[PDB]
């Protein structure tokens, strides 16, 4: 019935225009491979874009917006054709429509176009879609629109190179409010949007923390759904990459006992990997920040992972442990040793990841300095931690690291041996 459809689309009668646009929308609304390319070649894309400007016929507007959204849902070439026919500024105008159905369709259309590539996202942002998108969001916004707007916002923040922070800055108060929802879809999309905004320099993190999201993000670390957990953990993780004061905003809302529960409960390897990485950037902090990790009871489970977990988790547990030896006090480091961090740190000296070997060598060197200070204070004839590194088969591994091709590993191995085994 395609000739009657093209004919109906290309007619002047309001009844024929609607029935044929509805038929194309239903043809493109099928869940098993829609004929997007074929609907384009029938030349109805420019006529559907003309139907968007029919303010007197909001129902035709809606079907045309649906069909175009499904055309824009296809390959990169299909989205480009929708762009070429100037639909992007018209969908931005449709965000001010009196019809909620049309406004909702305009939102999903813009999210689809923006989701295609960073270039398409920048064109949507350049046509000023952000401010009218936020203006139609308030106390009486229905869940369907809250779900579409949050997804679209996430597509505006997604992609590498990241969008301009000044371009996406107005979305921060809205996302701060949206993460207080109980809806699993809104929480997912809001958290992903905040994980993109939070990734970058510390001035970006500062605007994220000033939006007031830290308390609620920590609560979302306990969300039973991994769809919400994963982007919330990513956002908390990005915030703790910041300075001591920014990292403290996460610690102040009991994030460390939450992070610990992710390590002990039976979750996916990638979840635990992210949780260890987050902890590693906390132990990269000041003495009080390392003390909060200790106070939470994290060292015990962290040392076990460093010793027994899958390599991707061990890698991150090594950074967490060694970062604490870098910024920790004499006693804090003695507490890491009492929790048995020496053997698992030594065991990784033979791992094929060069950076982890060097992370473990620096952690062990900082441990040896504490043991050397104890040897000077007690006027002892032996460095306790030298014998512990020897007993763990660490000394033989360090001795063998002198035969290594990597200059960072080699110079560290020689420095350690000349200082504690001359």
């Amino acid at each position: 019935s395609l000739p009657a459809m093209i004919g109906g689309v290309y007619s002047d009668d309001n009844n024929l225009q609607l029935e044929a646009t509805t038929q194309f929308r239903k043809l493109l609304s099928i869940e098993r491979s829609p004929p997007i390319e074929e609907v384009i070649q029938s030349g109805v894309v420019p006529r559907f874009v003309q139907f968007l400007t029919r303010e007197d016929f909001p129902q035709l507007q809606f079907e045309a917006a649906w069909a175009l959204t499904n055309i824009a849902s296809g390959t990169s070439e299909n989205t480009k054709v929708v762009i070429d026919h100037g639909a992007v500024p018209i969908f931005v105008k449709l965000l001010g429509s009196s019809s909620d159905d049309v406004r909702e369709q305009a939102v999903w259309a813009l999210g689809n176009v923006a989701g295609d590539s960073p270039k398409c996202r920048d064109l949507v942002l350049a046509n000023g879609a952000l401010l009218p998108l936020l203006a139609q969001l308030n106390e009486h916004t229905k869940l369907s629109m809250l779900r579409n707007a949050t997804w679209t916002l996430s597509n505006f923040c997604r992609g590498k190179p990241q969008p301009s922070f000044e371009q996406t800055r107005p979305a921060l108060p809205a996302l701060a409010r949206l993460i207080h929802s109980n809806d699993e879809e809104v929480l997912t999309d809001a958290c992903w949007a905040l994980s993109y905004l939070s990734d970058g320099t510390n001035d970006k993190i500062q605007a994220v923390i000033e939006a007031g999201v830290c308390p609620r993000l920590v609560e979302l670390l306990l969300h039973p759904s991994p769809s919400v957990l994963i982007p919330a953990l990513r956002t908390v993780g990005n915030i703790v990459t910041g300075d001591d004061a920014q990292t403290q905003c996460i610690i102040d809302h009991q994030a460390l006992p939450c992070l610990l529960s992710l390590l002990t409960q039976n979750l996916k390897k990638s979840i635990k990997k992210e949780a260890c990485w987050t902890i590693s950037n906390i132990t990269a902090g000041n003495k009080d920040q390392i003390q909060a990790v200790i106070n939470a009871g994290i060292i015990g489970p962290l040392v076990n992972l460093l010793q027994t977990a899958e390599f991707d988790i061990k890698k991150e547990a090594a950074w967490a442990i060694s970062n604490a030896t870098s910024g920790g006090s004499h006693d804090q480091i003695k507490y890491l040793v009492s929790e048995g961090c020496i053997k698992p740190l030594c065991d990784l000296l033979i791992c094929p990841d060069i950076r982890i070997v060097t992370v473990c060598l620096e952690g062990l060197e900082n441990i040896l300095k504490v043991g050397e200070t104890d040897k000077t204070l007690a006027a002892g004839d032996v460095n306790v931690f030298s014998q512990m590194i020897d007993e763990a088969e660490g000394l033989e591994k360090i001795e063998n690291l002198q035969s290594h091709d990597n200059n960072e590993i080699y110079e560290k191995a020689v420095k350690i041996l000349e200082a504690y085994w001359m």
Binding site: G237, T241, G242, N323, R355, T358, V359, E362
Partner: peptide, 9 residues
């Protein structure tokens, strides 16, 4: 020397 804060990738 190698230890400290790490940004995402």
């Amino acid at each position: 020397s190698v230890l400290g804060k790490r940004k995402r990738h």
